[PDB]
């Protein structure tokens with residue numbers, strides 16, 4: 001750990017804390033996450049091989065005095081801060097589209113390697129001056145676990161959790177990441193979180209109030225899920241034109257497919273990349289004031 005010079009606290013992610021730091025030998029500026037079971041060590045070691053331009057590179061894994069440090073490529077800003085800074089005028093549609101397109105490329109890559117994120121949220125989406133956006137922390141939830149409260153007692157957000165996770169499916173799939181990304185896509189467009197639940201049942205019921213309480217017609221097998229209760233209120237579905245208003249029919253169609261209830265009907269990252277919404281995708285440069 002002696003090999004790095006801490007510059008500043010970046011934040012309190014899930015898993016421990018994150019600092020901006022400089023490698024004393026290379027001069028490289030990195031992000032150091034302070035998180036150990038052998039199982040976690042081996043799984044974390046395989047993430048070092050998962051390199052893609054839209055995945056935050058894990059540079060090195062350091063285990064000493066049996067604490068764990070993950071060294072990552074550094075990016076100057078996250079999407080949560082960028083959305084907050086863009087709130088008065090909104091992120092231009094072409095930039096929303098580029099960001100969605102790149103995040104689906106990242107997801108398609110990890111998913112083809114059978115690696116899931118499981119806890120996607122705007123804070124783990126990092127951006128640079130060039131117009132790139134990258135996913136951070138892929139594979140970590142499978143390596144260690146995802147808390148109720150962070151290490152700082154901060155409340156882990158439920159806003160982006162897929163309904164099969166909320167209903168107790170133990171063996172959820174790559175579709176949970178598509179759901180979280182859909183929720184993010186909608187938030188970029190409207191400038192308000194889609195489903196801002198403050199409890200697991202509030203999260204589920206906000207989903208139901210917008211997309212309709214799921215049943216056996218739209219989601220075969222849903223009434224047999226572990227946490228499904230027949231006493232759930234039955235709400236009617238709303239139209240997407242009311243849910244993410246400004247967005248055109250190509251975008252609403254894609255969003256609807258990223259938000260299908262049945263994990264098996266939900267679009268894959270690979271199929272989402274071919275959706276007609278990306279017919280005019282481009283790569284604009286964002287306005288970043290660092």
Ligand SMILES: COc1ccc(CC(=O)Nc2cn([C@H]3C[C@@H](O)C3)cn2)cc1
Nearest residue numbers: 010018031072073074075076077078136
């Ligand atoms: C000025 O204070 C900050 C500087 C940068 C940022 C954006 C950020 O979070 N940058 C980052 C984080 N990471 C790694 C840690 C692993 O979870 C992903 C790499 N770059 C936030 C705050």
